[model samples]
Target: ANVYTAEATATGGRAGTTRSSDDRLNLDLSVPAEMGGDGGPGTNPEQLFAAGYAACFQGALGVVSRRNKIDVPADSTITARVGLQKFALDVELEGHFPGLSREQAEGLMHAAHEVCPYSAATRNNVDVRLKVRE
Candidate 1:
């Protein structure tokens, strides 16, 4: 397994956070326009969550496809949309499997959801909505 860490500092009000690392992506979780924030270019928690979920889902899909002897290329795209409400977070994942049928795609997605580390970690803790697209 691969491990990664990031450090961000916030000096004051909103625009005080800065990324300490340069090797990986550095995000400033100040606020954003979508959530009635200051509409700045800085990163927010929701964006981070979405990114994490997407990456995890993609990894899980790859594993499932390989195990099933499916020949999906590495260029397959997985788009995850994470929505935040007043009390919880919702995640919807769409995997673009060009040659797979809807049923096959959904089955793979369900299996991935059950096996993915992120899905397992977030299970029963956050409200998530999942979907698959061929």
Candidate 2:
């Protein structure tokens, strides 16, 4: 069995700063302009979640593709489009598969969804419309 531990600390709830225990990440937090927030240069919680999930989902797909012997292009990319509505969240992923068959690409995405920790964490709690780009 494998156990992982991560820690981050924050102040100001939604108007201050947040930092990781390792100092690798230190950021200012803000509310989005769409949500009637100031929308400063500082990042928002939804964007952070988007960033986290996008990268992790990409990595998860890579793992699945490699294990299943699928060839992925070096130019492939995964994008997380996130929106905060008043007090709700809406998200979707745009996965660009430049070199693989549709089935292979979708398989990688579906498999990644099944295994990505972020997706697993937000499964039913959040509504994510995941998709692949043409």
Candidate 3:
């Protein structure tokens, strides 16, 4: 059996609309000003992708920490910057794990990337820059 299946349907291209199968995620998408659109009252695909990547990476981090018997702070945050260039999209992720040494935190970040589904999806195809903040 599949562990989980996420379903969402989108129409209208980049400046269109999207909704999940459960209707929990219904959003209007727009091309931001940076990409020459009105940047109006809508979120773009890149932003949504960034949000998903960041959240998933954080979850992966939690799994890694627990497996390694390490304690990660509650306030640890993951920031993913997604950039769209022509037909290609790239990502940069920054993780801030307070109380952990920079080296240790970075190791965790790298390990998390190895397990993150988003990272796996974008591997080799998308360039992902990883950074750590103490």
Q: Which is the winner by TM-score between candidate 1 and candidate 2?
A: 2
Measured on C-alpha atoms, candidate 1 has an lDDT of 0.74
Which candidate order results from sorting by lDDT in descending order?
A: 3, 2, 1
Question: For this target, which candidate reaches the highest lDDT against the unseen true structure?
Answer: 3
- Tens-place lDDT per residue, model 1, 1-134, is 65965565544567645455563555555666766779876777677778888898888877877888876656667787877788688888888777777787778788889878888888898766767765
Q: Alpha-carbon error at 34 in model 2, in Å?
A: 2.5
Cα lDDT of model 2 by residue, 1-134, tens digit: 65867789989855699899998899998877776778788887888988998999888988887888877787888999887776877879878889787777777788888888888888887788767788
> Per-residue lDDT of 1-134 in model 3, one digit per residue for the tens?
98999899988865688899999999998878877888878887789999999999989988998899988889999999998887999899999998899998889899999999999988899999999975
- lDDT measured at residue 41 in model 1 versus the true structure, 0 to 100: 69
Q: Residue 3 error for model 1, in Å? A: 7.1
TM-score of model number 3:
0.92
Could you tell me the C-alpha RMSD of candidate 1 in Å?
2.9
Clashing residue pairs, backbone N/CA/C < 3 A, model 3? none
Kindly give the number of clashing pairs for every candidate.
0, 0, 0
Kindly provide the TM-score of model 1 when superposed on the true structure, using C-alpha atoms.
Answer: 0.79
Collision pairs in model 2: none
